Write a protein that binds this DNA or RNA. Structure first.
Ligand SMILES: CN(C)[C@@H]1C(O)=C(C(N)=O)C(=O)[C@@]2(O)C(O)=C3C(=O)c4c(O)cccc4[C@@](C)(O)[C@H]3C[C@@H]12
Ligand SMILES: [K+]
Ligand SMILES: [K+]
Ligand SMILES: [K+]
Ligand SMILES: [K+]
Ligand SMILES: [K+]
Ligand SMILES: [K+]
Ligand SMILES: [K+]
Ligand SMILES: [K+]
Ligand SMILES: [K+]
Ligand SMILES: [K+]
Ligand SMILES: [K+]
Ligand SMILES: [K+]
Ligand SMILES: [Mg+2]
Ligand SMILES: [Mg+2]
Ligand SMILES: [Mg+2]
Ligand SMILES: [Mg+2]
Ligand SMILES: [Mg+2]
Ligand SMILES: [Mg+2]
Ligand SMILES: [Mg+2]
Ligand SMILES: [Mg+2]
Ligand SMILES: [Mg+2]
Ligand SMILES: [Mg+2]
Ligand SMILES: [Mg+2]
Ligand SMILES: [Mg+2]
Ligand SMILES: [Mg+2]
Ligand SMILES: [Mg+2]
Ligand SMILES: [Mg+2]
Ligand SMILES: [Mg+2]
Ligand SMILES: [Mg+2]
Ligand SMILES: [Mg+2]
Ligand SMILES: [Mg+2]
Ligand SMILES: [Mg+2]
Ligand SMILES: [Mg+2]
Ligand SMILES: [Mg+2]
Ligand SMILES: [Mg+2]
Ligand SMILES: [Mg+2]
Ligand SMILES: [Mg+2]
Ligand SMILES: [Mg+2]
Ligand SMILES: [Mg+2]
Ligand SMILES: [Mg+2]
Ligand SMILES: [Mg+2]
Ligand SMILES: [Mg+2]
Ligand SMILES: [Mg+2]
Lengths: 115, 96, 84, 146, 50, 66, 206, 100, 125
RNA sequence: AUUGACGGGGGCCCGCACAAGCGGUGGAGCAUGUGGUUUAAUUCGAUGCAACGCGAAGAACCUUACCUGGUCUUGACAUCCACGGAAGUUUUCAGAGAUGAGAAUGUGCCUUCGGGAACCGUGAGACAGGUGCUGCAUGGCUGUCGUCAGCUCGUGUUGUGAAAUGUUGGGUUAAGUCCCGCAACGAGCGCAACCCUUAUCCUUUGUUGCCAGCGGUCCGGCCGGGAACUCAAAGGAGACUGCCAGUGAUAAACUGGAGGAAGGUGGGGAUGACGUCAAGUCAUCAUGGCCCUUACGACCAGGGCUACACACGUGCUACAAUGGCGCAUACAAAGAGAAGCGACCUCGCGAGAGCAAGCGGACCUCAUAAAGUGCGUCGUAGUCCGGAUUGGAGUCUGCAACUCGACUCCAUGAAGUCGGAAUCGCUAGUAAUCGUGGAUCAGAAUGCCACGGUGAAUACGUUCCCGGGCCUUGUACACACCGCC
C-alpha cells in the first residue's frame, strides 16, 4: 500500500502497481516481484503485510523517488555548470541529442510563440 | 562426373551452346540440359539530368542458366568437350 | 560513443603537446584543432585553446571535464536570438 | 460513371448461416481487410441477439433492419443556382445498405466495452425502435420537402 | 519564266502561327508551300497549264 | 470504258492519283468490291480517255477537253 | 513530348547489342570502361574512315573488335599495316590479346550514323543546312529506304535564336517495335556552337 | 566533376592500396581481445599517423566517364545518366528496358 | 486409381489426389480443421464435394504451397474441382455453374513509379 | 472576310472531374524538404498546376562546390623541352595537416655496350585549371498539356486572296476506331497491332527443385529409387466478336447467350504524334561567347551544409478494446551476397562478441514473415493507450561519432481522447491494413524502388466543380479574356 513513501494502487496487479514508483519501470517491477517471491498478477490489496514488507526491502535496493530526482537534477546541473554543448542546450531549452530545430522540437520548446 | 554450368544474357545463345555440348558428349550418357532459374537483375534510374523525380527508366539484365551432367565420361569426352568451341557471351564452368 | 574495448581516442599530436606542457610546467594556452580528442586527467589545470571553425577558444580544463571531447567546450555556431 | 456499365461482384454467403445479407454486413463492419475479426464480432453479436430475443439469429437481424431501412431520402439537384433537396424512393438494395451502414456507425459510437456487445445492443434497440440508427432513419424521413 | 513576288503568309493555330510562302509566276501561276522553293515550283507548274 | 456508280471528284483531273487505285485493284474481298463498284470500268483506259447529276464529270471533261 | 531511344527500345526485338560479352559484377564495370576506351580510341583514329559501328566481343581472356566501315581499304591499310597498329593499341587499352575484324558497310547512304556524320561534316564546312538534309533524304530514298527522317537542331545558319528543322520521306513508324529503325546522332561543333543531327532510317518490318 | 576532384580520388585509391596490409595489421591488434593494453594503445596511436586518405571510407564512388559523385551504380561503374546513354546504344550487354 | 487435379489461386498451388473412400481430408499431413483455422477456408475447401454430394464418398490427399490461408483454400477448391471432373466428367456443368472451374486470375498489381502503391498517388497540395 | 483563341453562347462527348462510397491531410509528437530569419559560412540549383522525402540511389572526416585560418604558383590534373636522377621501399624530427628537413636501402628492364622508356624531381613557357557568368547564344537529356485523339501533307478541286476541302456529315468506337455518304483521291505521323509480364494447357529436359506409386527407415525426400505431380524455362497451343440469337441502314457495330482458364483492348506494363510553356538543366556531360590566371586555379586542418522567435509542403507514429500486453502456434513472394552473405556452437538482459562451417548460390547465408489463430490478462482510465523528451550505462562501423551516426539496456513517460474553414487518394485483388526485400552505402531510411499476405465500400446518374475532345455561333481578342478598353 505504502512503498517508497508513495501510495501504490491496491486494485491493480502487483507488476503494474509498482510502476507507480518513480524509478521503477516494467523490467525492475518484474525483478522486484521475482526477488520478493510474489506473483505478478496478484493485486496489492490481496497481499499480506509481511509481503508488503518484502517489497519495501526489494525497492530499497534501487535509487527511486526523491533520491532519483536529486540524482537527475544534479546530473543536468553538472552539465549546465560545465558549459559543455549539452549544458548550453539545457540552458536554452532546446534539443540536447542532435535533433532538428528548424521544425519540430516542440517537446523542448513548448507551444509556438507567434512573431 | 563433369557438371557444366552455362550462363548467358541471351537464351538463344545458351540453348545453342548446350546443344553443341550434348551433341559432342552423346557421341557417355549426359543428363539435361536442366533450365535453372533465370536471374532478373533490375535497375531504376532517373532520366532527367535535373529534378523530375517521377521520370524514370527501368532496366533488366536476365542471366539465363543451364546445367548439363556428363556420366561414365571417356578420354574422348574430356577431349571432344575441350576441342569444342562455344560462342562468345556464354560463360562455361566445369566441376569434377 | 567509442567502444570501451578500443579505449578513449586522443590525437597523438595533442597527447605529445600535453605531456610536454605537463613536464615543462605551467604553460601558455595549448593551441589545437583536435576537437575530437578526449580530455584526459593529465590535462587538468592546462588551458587548451580549441578551434571552433574560426578562433581558438580558451578551455581551462577541470576534473569534471575529464572524459568529454574538447569540442564540447567550443561552440561552432553563433546565435543570439531572432528579432533582436 | 459517364459510361455506366457497372455490374456487381459475387458476394459469398456468410459461412455460419449462409446469408449474403449477413456477408454484406460483415464487410461493412470490417476494417483494414480483417474479415476474420469482423466475422467473430458479427457472430458474437448475433448469439447475444438470439439469447435476448428467443429466435433465430437472422430473424432478429431482419427485425433490426426493418426498423432502420429508409424508404425515401433527399438528393441535391442544381436547378436555378440555388440547390434543392429533392426526395426520391430508395431501391431495396440501397435500403439494406444504408440500414447496415447506420447500424454499424451507431454501434461504433456506443459506450459499451466490446464492439460485439455494442452491436448486439444496437440491434436490440433497433428491433424496438430506440437507438441512434433508427433516429437517423427518422431524421432522413423528416428531411424527405419537390 | 517570270516570278513576280514572294509573300510570306500566316495562319494562327493553338500552338502559335504557321508561316508559309506564296509565289506568283507568269511564263499565270500562284503557288503556295511551306518553303519558297516549293511555292515557286507549284506556281511555275500552274503557269504552264494556265 | 465507263464510270457507272459515283464519279470520284478528280477521276481525270487528278488521274495520276486515281491510277494508283487502278494499280491497287489490279494487284488484288471488300477492298475489291469497293473498287469494282467504282474504278472497274477505267482499269484498262491507260490515260485521259476519248469521250464520255454529273456536273462534276462534265466539269472535269471541260477542263481537259475530253 | 520526349521520345524513347529507337535503338534502345528494339534491343532483343529486332536490334542486336553492340557489346556481346558475359561478365559477373566483379568484371562488369571494368569491361564497360575498357570498351569505352576502345571505342573512344577507334572513333578518334578512324574519323576519316566512315566508321558506323564498333562491335566488341570478349571471348575468354581476349577482346574481338569488329569495325563496321564504309571505307575498309584505308582502315586495313597496306597489306594490313594500319589494322595492325590499331590491334596493338586495342590490346594495350583492353590489357588482353586483341583481334580487329573489319565488316564493310555497303550502302553508307542507308547507315544512320554515316548519314548523320556526313551532315555534321557539311555543317562544319559551312554548307547550308537545308541542302545537306535534303540530299541525305534523297540519297537514302534513291537506294531503297522505305523511309528516312533527318532532324537538325541549334543555331542554324548562325541564327541567334536556335531552332529545330526536320524532313521526312516514306514511312518512319517509331511505335512499331518490329520496324527496322536504324537511328543515330551526331554533333557539329560550329563557330556559333553545337548543332545536333538525328537520323532515322526505316528499312522494313523485321 | 572538376579535374582536381577526379585527381583526389586517384590519390585515395593509391594510398588505400599502399597501406592496406599495414592498416589491417594495426586494426587487428586494436580488435584483438587478448592483446596488451600497451599494444592496443600503441596501435591506436599508430593508425592515426598514417595518411587519412589511406582509409577506404574516404573514397567516393564516381562515374568513370564524368566523375559525377551522385547517382552511381556499382554494377556499371557509371552514373545514372551515362548508364542510360550506354544502355540505349546497346553498349551494356544484356541490359534492356524492363516491364512486368 | 487416384484422380488428380492442380489448383491455383494468387501465389498458391495445390496438388489434389482423390480416391473412393469416406470423407478423409489430409492437407500437408494435417487434417482440414488443423490446417485451416477459419470457417471460410474450411467452407471453401468443402464447397465442391458439398455441391456434387460426395463429402463422405471420397478421400482427399492434398498438398499446397505458396500464398496465404485464403490463397491456399482457393487453390485447393480449384484442385478438388478438377480432380472431380477427372473422376466424373458429367459434374463439369454443375461445377462450372457454381463458378469453381474458373481459375481466379486476380493477382497483386505491381507497384509503379511515382505512386505509393499500384494506384495510390501521393497527396497533391 | 480568313485562321485561331476566348464567351457568365448553343449542341454533343470524355476522365476518380463530380456524384455514390471507403480511407486520409488540415489539429498532436516526431521524420523530412522548402521559405524565412540567423550565421564566419549556413554551398549551388528546383518555384502555380508541372518547385518543396525535388537534382541528393543515402553531408561525421571524405563527399564539398561554402566559411575561417594555414599554404602553392607551368601548378592537384596533360602534352612538348632541357638537365640531373632507376623506380620504389624502410624510417626519424618539426608541423593541425598541407609540407619542410634528414637518415637508410634499391639501381633494374629494353640494350646495333649508340642506347632509349617504365618512373621521379627541378628550371622554363607555350599552356594547364575554373561546380566562374549567360538554360534568353546552344547540343543532349527531361517535365508538361496527355496516352489526350489528335496533327498534317501530296495531287485534285473551290476562293481575287488570307484560306478551304480532304479531317465535315449519318451511324459507331477506348480511339481521325470502323462503316456509309461525300469534290475529293490517296498518304504520313499518331490510335491499334507487333514487345514484356500475368491467367489455362501441351511437348521437351529433370538437379541443387519434385515425392504420386513402390522398397526401406534413424520417420527427416532421410535413403534406394521414381519422372507422375508442384516447380524450373525453352518451344508450342489458346480469344478472333470466331460460334449462336436479337438489334441495326442487306453496314459498321451493339445487347445477350454458348463453349472456354480466360470474352469483347481478359488484367498490368513498356510505348508519349505535330506542337505548347524563351518550362527545367552551362553544377552530369558537351558547347558559342564572356570572365579569372602568384587566382574565380590548387593543397590542407578545423567549422558549415544538421543553425531556430517562426510559416508552408510531403510523410511516420498515435490518440486505443475491430485494441495493448504475455504465452503458444499457422500460411508468402520477391530479392541480395566475396575488402561479401555469414550458419552452428559458446559468451552477453541486449545491441553485440568470440570461434568458425557453407556459399559466386533452385544447394549455403541474409531469413523471425507480419497481420492471423488459440489461450490468458487489462476493463475504458490520459489507462497495462501513446512513446515524444531527458538522465545514466553500453554496442558497432569508422583514422575519428563534441558540433553531427545507428542501435541496445535501465530509468523517464510529453503532446495526443479522432482534428475548424478547407483539402487529397482510390472503381478491385483496387482502397485500407500487414509484414518482406533492394539500390545508394564503411556506417547512416519514417524516403525511394520493388515483393507478397489479408482484403472492402460504392457508382442513381452527368445538373454542378476541374481538365480535355468534336461541331457550330458572336467577337472591337491575336502579348490571343491573366485579352481589349
Ligand atoms: C519566375 N517564373 C518561374 C517565371 C515564369 O513564370 C515563366 C513562365 N513561362 O511561366 C517563365 O518563363 C520563367 O520561368 C522563365 O523561364 C524566365 C526566363 O527564361 C527569362 C530569361 O531567361 C531572361 C529574362 C527574363 C525571363 C523571364 C521573365 O521570362 C523568366 C520568368 C520565369
Ligand atoms: K515508474
Ligand atoms: K541540429
Ligand atoms: K535545352
Ligand atoms: K490541298
Ligand atoms: K558555357
Ligand atoms: K517521414
Ligand atoms: K503532415
Ligand atoms: K502508458
Ligand atoms: K556524429
Ligand atoms: K489529421
Ligand atoms: K550503409
Ligand atoms: K466556341
Ligand atoms: Mg539527425
Ligand atoms: Mg550516450
Ligand atoms: Mg571538366
Ligand atoms: Mg562514402
Ligand atoms: Mg500490397
Ligand atoms: Mg515523391
Ligand atoms: Mg466526392
Ligand atoms: Mg499535422
Ligand atoms: Mg548556376
Ligand atoms: Mg537551398
Ligand atoms: Mg533557373
Ligand atoms: Mg509561370
Ligand atoms: Mg565536410
Ligand atoms: Mg608531428
Ligand atoms: Mg529553356
Ligand atoms: Mg482536326
Ligand atoms: Mg487512323
Ligand atoms: Mg470523309
Ligand atoms: Mg459470354
Ligand atoms: Mg500503341
Ligand atoms: Mg527560362
Ligand atoms: Mg575539409
Ligand atoms: Mg540540406
Ligand atoms: Mg505501451
Ligand atoms: Mg543490400
Ligand atoms: Mg540469386
Ligand atoms: Mg524502457
Ligand atoms: Mg493533455
Ligand atoms: Mg479509372
Ligand atoms: Mg509498408
Ligand atoms: Mg473525337
Amino acid at each position: 500500500a505504502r512503498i517508497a513513501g508513495i501510495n501504490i494502487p491496491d486494485h491493480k496487479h502487483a507488476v503494474i502497481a509498482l510502476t507507480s514508483i518513480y524509478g521503477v519501470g516494467k523490467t525492475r517491477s518484474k525483478a522486484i516481484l521475482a526477488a520478493a517471491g510474489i506473483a505478478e498478477d496478484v493485486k496489492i490489496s490481496e497481499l499480506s503485510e509481511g509481503q508488503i514488507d518484502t517489497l519495501r526491502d526489494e525497492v530499497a535496493k534501487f535509487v527511486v523517488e526523491g533520491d532519483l530526482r536529486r540524482e537527475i537534477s544534479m546530473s543536468i546541473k553538472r552539465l549546465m555548470d560545465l558549459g559543455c554543448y549539452r549544458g548550453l542546450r539545457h540552458r536554452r531549452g532546446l534539443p540536447v541529442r542532435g535533433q532538428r530545430t528548424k521544425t519540430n522540437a516542440r517537446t523542448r520548446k513548448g507551444p509556438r510563440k507567434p512573431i | 562426373r563433369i557438371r557444366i554450368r552455362l550462363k548467358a544474357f541471351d537464351h538463344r545463345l545458351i540453348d545453342q551452346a548446350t546443344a553443341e555440348i550434348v551433341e559432342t558428349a552423346k557421341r557417355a550418357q549426359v543428363r539435361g540440359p536442366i533450365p535453372l532459374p533465370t536471374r532478373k537483375e533490375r535497375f531504376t534510374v532517373l532520366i532527367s539530368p535535373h529534378v523530375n523525380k517521377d521520370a524514370r527508366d527501368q532496366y533488366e539484365i536476365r542471366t539465363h542458366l543451364r546445367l548439363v551432367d556428363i556420366v561414365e565420361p571417356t578420354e574422348k569426352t574430356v577431349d571432344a568437350l575441350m576441342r569444342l568451341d562455344l560462342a562468345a557471351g556464354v560463360d562455361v564452368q566445369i566441376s569434377l | 560513443p567509442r567502444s570501451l574495448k578500443k579505449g578513449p581516442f586522443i590525437d597523438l599530436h595533442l597527447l605529445k603537446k600535453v605531456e610536454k606542457a605537463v613536464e615543462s610546467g605551467d604553460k601558455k594556452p595549448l593551441r589545437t584543432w583536435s576537437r575530437r580528442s578526449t580530455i584526459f586527467p593529465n590535462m587538468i589545470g592546462l588551458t587548451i585553446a580549441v578551434h571552433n571553425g574560426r578562433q581558438h577558444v580558451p578551455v581551462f580544463v577541470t576534473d569534471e571535464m575529464v572524459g568529454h571531447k574538447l569540442g564540447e567546450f567550443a561552440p561552432t555556431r553563433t546565435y543570439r536570438g531572432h528579432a533582436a | 460513371p459517364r459510361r455506366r456499365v457497372i455490374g456487381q461482384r459475387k458476394i459469398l454467403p456468410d459461412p455460419k448461416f449462409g446469408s449474403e445479407l449477413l456477408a454484406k454486413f460483415v464487410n461493412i463492419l470490417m476494417v483494414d481487410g480483417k474479415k476474420s475479426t469482423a466475422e467473430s464480432i458479427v457472430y458474437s453479436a448475433l448469439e447475444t441477439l438470439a439469447q435476448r430475443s428467443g429466435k433465430s439469429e437472422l430473424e432478429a437481424f431482419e427485425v433490426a433492419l426493418e426498423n432502420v431501412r429508409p424508404t425515401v431520402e433527399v438528393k441535391s439537384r442544381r436547378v436555378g443556382g440555388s440547390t434543392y433537396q429533392v426526395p426520391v424512393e430508395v431501391r431495396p438494395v440501397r435500403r439494406n445498405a444504408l440500414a447496415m451502414r447506420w447500424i454499424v456507425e451507431a454501434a461504433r459510437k456506443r459506450g459499451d466495452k466490446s464492439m460485439a456487445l455494442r452491436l448486439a445492443n444496437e440491434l436490440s434497440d433497433a428491433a424496438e425502435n430506440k437507438g441512434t440508427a433508427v433516429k437517423k432513419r427518422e431524421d432522413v424521413h423528416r428531411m424527405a420537402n419537390f | 519564266e517570270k516570278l513576280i513576288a514572294v509573300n510570306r503568309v500566316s495562319k494562327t493555330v493553338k500552338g502559335g502561327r504557321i508561316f508559309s510562302f506564296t509565289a506568283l509566276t507568269v511564263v499565270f501561276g500562284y503557288g503556295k508551300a511551306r518553303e519558297v522553293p516549293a511555292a515557286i515550283q507549284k506556281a511555275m507548274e500552274k503557269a504552264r497549264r494556265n | 470504258f465507263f464510270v457507272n456508280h459515283r464519279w470520284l471528284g478528280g477521276m481525270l483531273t487528278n488521274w495520276k492519283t486515281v491510277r494508283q487505285s487502278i494499280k491497287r485493284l489490279k494487284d488484288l474481298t471488300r477492298e475489291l468490291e469497293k473498287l469494282e463498284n467504282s474504278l472497274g470500268g477505267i482499269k484498262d483506259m491507260g490515260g485521259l480517255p476519248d469521250a464520255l447529276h454529273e456536273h462534276i464529270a462534265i466539269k472535269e471533261a471541260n477542263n481537259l477537253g475530253i | 513530348g520526349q521520345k524513347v531511344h529507337p535503338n534502345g527500345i528494339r534491343l532483343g526485338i529486332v536490334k542486336p547489342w553492340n557489346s556481346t560479352w558475359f561478365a559477373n559484377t566483379k568484371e562488369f564495370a571494368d569491361n564497360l570502361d575498357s570498351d569505352f576506351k576502345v571505342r573512344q580510341y577507334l572513333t578518334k583514329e578512324l574519323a576519316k574512315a566512315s566508321v558506323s559501328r564498333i562491335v566488341i566481343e570478349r571471348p575468354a581472356k581476349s577482346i574481338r573488335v569488329t569495325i563496321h566501315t564504309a571505307r575498309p581499304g584505308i582502315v586495313i591499310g597496306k597489306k594490313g599495316e594500319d589494322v595492325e597498329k590499331l590491334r596493338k593499341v586495342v590490346a594495350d587499352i583492353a590489357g588482353v590479346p586483341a583481334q580487329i575484324n573489319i565488316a564493310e558497310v555497303r550502302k553508307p547512304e542507308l547507315d544512320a550514323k554515316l548519314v548523320a556524320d556526313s551532315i555534321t561534316s557539311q555543317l562544319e564546312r559551312r554548307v547550308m543546312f537545308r541542302r545537306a538534309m535534303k540530299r541525305a533524304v534523297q540519297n537514302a530514298m534513291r537506294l531503297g529506304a522505305k523511309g528516312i527522317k533527318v532532324e537538325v537542331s541549334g543555331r542554324l545558319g548562325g541564327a541567334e535564336i536556335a531552332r529545330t528543322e526536320w524532313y521526312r520521306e516514306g514511312r518512319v513508324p517509331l511505335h512499331t517495335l518490329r520496324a527496322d529503325i536504324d537511328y543515330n546522332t551526331s554533333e557539329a561543333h560550329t563557330t556559333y556552337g553545337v548543332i545536333g543531327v538525328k537520323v532515322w532510317i526505316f528499312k522494313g518490318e523485321i | 566533376a572538376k579535374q582536381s576532384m577526379k585527381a583526389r580520388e586517384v590519390k585515395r585509391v593509391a594510398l588505400a592500396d599502399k597501406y592496406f596490409a599495414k592498416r589491417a595489421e594495426l586494426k587487428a591488434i586494436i580488435s584483438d581481445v587478448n592483446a596488451s593494453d600497451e599494444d592496443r594503445w600503441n596501435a591506436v596511436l599508430k593508425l592515426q599517423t598514417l595518411p587519412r586518405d589511406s582509409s577506404p571510407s574516404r573514397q567516393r564512388n564516381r562515374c568513370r566517364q564524368t566523375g559525377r559523385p551522385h547517382g552511381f551504380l556499382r554494377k556499371f561503374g557509371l552514373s545514372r545518366i551515362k548508364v542510360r546513354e550506354a544502355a540505349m546504344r546497346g553498349e551494356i550487354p544484356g541490359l534492356k528496358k524492363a516491364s512486368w | 486409381n487416384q484422380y488428380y487435379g492442380t489448383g491455383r489461386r494468387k501465389s498458391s498451388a495445390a496438388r489434389v489426389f482423390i480416391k473412393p473412400g469416406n470423407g478423409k481430408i489430409v492437407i500437408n499431413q494435417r487434417s482440414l480443421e488443423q490446417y485451416f483455422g477459419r470457417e471460410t477456408a474450411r467452407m471453401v475447401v468443402r464447397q465442391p464435394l458439398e455441391l456434387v454430394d460426395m463429402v463422405e464418398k471420397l478421400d482427399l490427399y492434398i498438398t499446397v504451397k505458396g500464398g496465404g490461408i485464403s490463397g491456399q483454400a482457393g487453390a485447393i477448391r480449384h484442385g478438388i474441382t478438377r480432380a472431380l471432373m477427372e473422376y466424373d466428367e458429367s459434374l463439369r456443368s454443375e461445377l462450372r455453374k457454381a463458378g469453381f472451374v474458373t481459375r481466379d486470375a486476380r493477382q497483386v498489381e505491381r507497384k509503379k513509379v511515382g505512386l505509393r502503391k499500384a494506384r495510390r498517388r501521393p497527396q497533391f497540395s
